[PDB]
């Protein structure tokens, strides 16, 4: 089974950029838009869970609405010469009527819509 195109709109679309210094937390924004007539459930995933704090990391976007997801890069030891293998992904699914975690649990993979972003470190 093939996966369906992403329903949400993403800003940025492909790239999450983090500019140093990395002494303090570096927050970058990921705006998710729901331009549809139905509420859309979303979950944020990443290849480096312990390096970030994502607020919110999941939830529901109302119809015709937009959410600012704060991707927070925790302070670390930056090596300019190392390439950030860090990636993110937004999974989405249509919220069933009159409705959570029980929904995600029984969601088959083609029911999920994926969008991947790559993390870029500068300075």
């Amino acid at each position: 089974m093939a996966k369906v195109e992403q329903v949400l709109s993403l800003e940025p679309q492909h790239e999450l950029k983090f500019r140093g210094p990395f002494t303090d937390v570096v927050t970058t924004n990921l705006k998710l838009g729901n331009p549809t007539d139905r509420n859309v459930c979303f979950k944020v995933k990443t290849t480096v869970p312990r390096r970030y704090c994502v607020r919110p990391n999941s939830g529901v976007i109302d119809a015709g609405a937009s959410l600012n997801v704060s991707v927070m890069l925790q302070p670390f030891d930056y090596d300019p010469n190392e390439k950030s293998k860090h990636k993110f992904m937004v999974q989405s699914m249509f919220a069933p009527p009159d409705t959570m975690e029980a929904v995600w649990k029984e969601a088959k993979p083609e029911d999920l819509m994926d969008s991947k972003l790559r993390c870029v470190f500068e300075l």
């Binding site: 944020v44 990443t46 290849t47 970030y52 994502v54 293998k85």
Partner: peptide
Amino acid sequence: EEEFFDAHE
């Protein structure tokens, strides 16, 4: 390959 995990809060 590069497995994705649920992001932490």
